[PDB]
Amino acid sequence: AGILFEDIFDVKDIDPEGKKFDRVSRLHCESESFKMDLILDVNIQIYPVDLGDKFRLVIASTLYEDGTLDDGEYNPTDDRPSRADQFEYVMYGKVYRIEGDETSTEAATRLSAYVSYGGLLMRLQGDANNLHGFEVDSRVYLLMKKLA
């Protein structure tokens, strides 16, 4: 599969601190199932989302749904069946931080994974059990599709 994470989120705030970038908005979203908090910078100009929307989110290691590594290089001419065909918005970034509530005595129960899609930042906070696929300086694909 190569899907590090999957859920359905709903947007609970669009641009909370006031608009600071005319094409990018910092969505704050909640997950009903995993109860993960999500902060995610989205290029609203090409993929407009407004308040109260819902969307399936998927963080995947690859897109070819076979475990074949992506090579991290832009190949426009790809014949392999891409997972991105099932999604509307697709970004590609690198996880650059994994914080948690760990002490020196006990492991973390809550983890916060931070990803940078070319500058567009995302944080995903929640229980540690769902974020074991994330490891720092690994490449990930964020696949987001609006749900009716």
């Binding site: 609970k12 705030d13 641009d15 704050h28």
Partner: protein, 526 residues
């Protein structure tokens, strides 16, 4: 082989050691006398090292009693020593072994329980052990004379009976003793979600009674508050219990906001569109205390994140919550007053603008519009939380305190805010700063004492003087209590009801001056 060569030495170690004759000495002596050898030198070994420590204690203890020092000091010292030795050397396995050899502990337990310190010993032993049979039995039986929550909720029948008895005590507590009657029940309910849902459903059905079920609804909301304090989301509980099912949009919106313990423009926008529709859902549906506290901390702490296109939406929903009259024609909203809405929203808007601007002197500039607008109750609560968070900053009294004046408008003009204001100032009367010296701390304390005396003048007299008695018996120096009496007898007019004397005069026994104190004591004893 025969264990004589080892077990006889095991027994002779406890024979020939210094001072063991007074004891398991019988058991080891039997193990030796049955094992043979030299039983005559055993008795000599027992009595050889008999240092007569006990008669030494006789001499010493009776000499301390000869000295005129209180023997109860000796009793406390011996009890503390032996109890500490027990706690340091208590073994839960051996307590369960005492249970194993017989279910009911012999009369030594029932003689210890007569002693208060040993009852507290069993409380500290058994409150932490929810599976040790001796300890669980002792705590449960002493409750029959804390009921351990594990055995409180182990079955319906025990939980129900302790629940109804404790709730009867809460209702008997009126409005003061609940502080002691509610936690024993609440922590019992707040252990599992099934005992939770059961107790909440029972209190919901009980709340439908118009002959006081409002109080059961209050206690249910308090238990839900405590369940939140234990980190358990009872959002969907209140949803499926109340009329949230009548409106799925309000249900999902509100329940999400409650589950997070925070607001959001999304659910807020849902409720705004619902109450902007021609059919606004019930105002009771949003009138939930923690929810309105979310409104407070959104609109009156520095920050939070806020948009102007939603600032007015938060304000208008809170105005609808605080303003609209829905009359039930057999649970039918047929008359909707929304005429006291716009003024309330305007006042909330202006006051929230001031509060989130992080105001002092500018307060005094627009204090006219403030005391005009504190007449709105919800606005009074909002300013109360704002001034609480500003003044609760460490060392906010070294830099302007005008904020304490505003309670005068609040408490005087709103009776039911007397409990909050005093329950604010109880924190502020315990203010302590190393920068602002004890002189300035006492200055602020005496200022707060004048505020509390004014609040007493509005009728909030029983808990004021009760807490004044408690902190004098504790913290509050005699100077502060004397100044309290000075200001009181300088402002209060006779007659003085005995409900006030019963706490004010027996704490005034410490002093006799502020002479008005002599007049007060003479009048109130005669």
């Amino acid at each position: 082989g025969e264990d004589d060569a080892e077990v006889q030495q095991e027994c002779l170690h406890k024979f020939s050691t210094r001072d063991y004759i007074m004891e398991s000495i019988f058991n080891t002596l039997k193990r030796y006398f049955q094992a043979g050898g030299s039983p005559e030198n055993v008795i000599q070994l027992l009595s050889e090292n008999y240092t007569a420590v006990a008669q030494t204690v006789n001499l010493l203890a009776e000499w301390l009693i000869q000295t005129g020092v209180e023997p109860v000091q000796v009793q406390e010292t011996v009890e503390n020593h032996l109890k500490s030795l027990l706690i340091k050397h208590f073994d839960p396995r051996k307590a369960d072994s005492i249970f194993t050899e017989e279910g009911e502990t012999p009369a030594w337990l029932e003689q210890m329980i007569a002693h208060t310190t040993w009852r507290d010993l069993f409380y500290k032993l058994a409150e932490a052990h929810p599976d040790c049979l001796m300890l669980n039995f002792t705590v449960k039986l002493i409750s029959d004379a804390i009921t351990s929550v594990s055995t409180a909720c182990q079955q319906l029948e025990v939980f129900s009976r302790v629940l109804r008895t404790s709730l009867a005590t809460i209702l008997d507590g009126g409005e003061e003793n609940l502080e002691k009657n509610l936690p024993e029940f609440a922590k019992m309910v707040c252990h599992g979600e099934h005992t939770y849902l059961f107790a909440q459903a029972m209190m919901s059905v009980l709340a439908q009674e118009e002959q006081g079920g409002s109080a059961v609804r209050r206690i249910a909301q308090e238990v839900q508050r405590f369940a939140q304090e234990k980190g358990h989301d009872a959002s969907q509980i209140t949803l499926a219990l109340g009329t949230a099912a009548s409106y799925p949009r309000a249900c999902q919106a509100l329940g999400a906001m409650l589950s997070k313990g925070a607001l959001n423009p999304a659910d807020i926008t849902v409720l705004f569109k619902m109450f902007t529709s021609m059919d606004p859902p019930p105002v009771e549906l949003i009138r939930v205390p923690a929810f309105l506290d979310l409104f407070m901390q959104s609109l009156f702490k520095p920050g939070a994140r806020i948009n102007q296109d939603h600032k007015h939406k938060y304000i208008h929903i809170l105005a609808y919550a605080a303003s609209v009259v829905e009359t039930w024609k057999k649970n039918k909203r047929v008359s909707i007053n929304k005429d006291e809405l716009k003024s309330t929203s305007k006042a909330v808007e202006t006051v929230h603008n001031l509060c989130c601007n992080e105001n002092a002197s500018e307060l005094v500039a627009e204090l006219s519009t403030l005391y005009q607008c504190i007449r709105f109750p919800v606005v009074a609560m909002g300013v109360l939380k704002w001034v609480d968070w500003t003044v609760s900053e460490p060392r906010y009294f070294q830099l302007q305190p005008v904020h304490l004046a505003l309670l005068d408008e609040i408490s005087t003009c709103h009776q039911l805010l007397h409990p909050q204001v005093l329950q604010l100032l109880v924190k502020l009367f315990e203010t302590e700063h190393s920068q602002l010296d004890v002189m300035e701390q006492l200055e602020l304390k005496k200022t707060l004492l004048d505020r509390m005396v004014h609040l007493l003048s509005r009728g909030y007299v029983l808990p004021v003087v009760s807490y004044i008695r408690k902190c004098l018996e504790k913290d509050t120096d005699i100077s502060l209590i004397r100044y309290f009496v000075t200001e009181v007898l300088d402002v209060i007019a006779p007659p003085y009801t005995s409900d006030f004397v019963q706490l004010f005069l027996p704490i005034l026994e410490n002093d006799s001056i502020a002479d008005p104190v002599t007049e007060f004591i003479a009048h109130c004893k005669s």
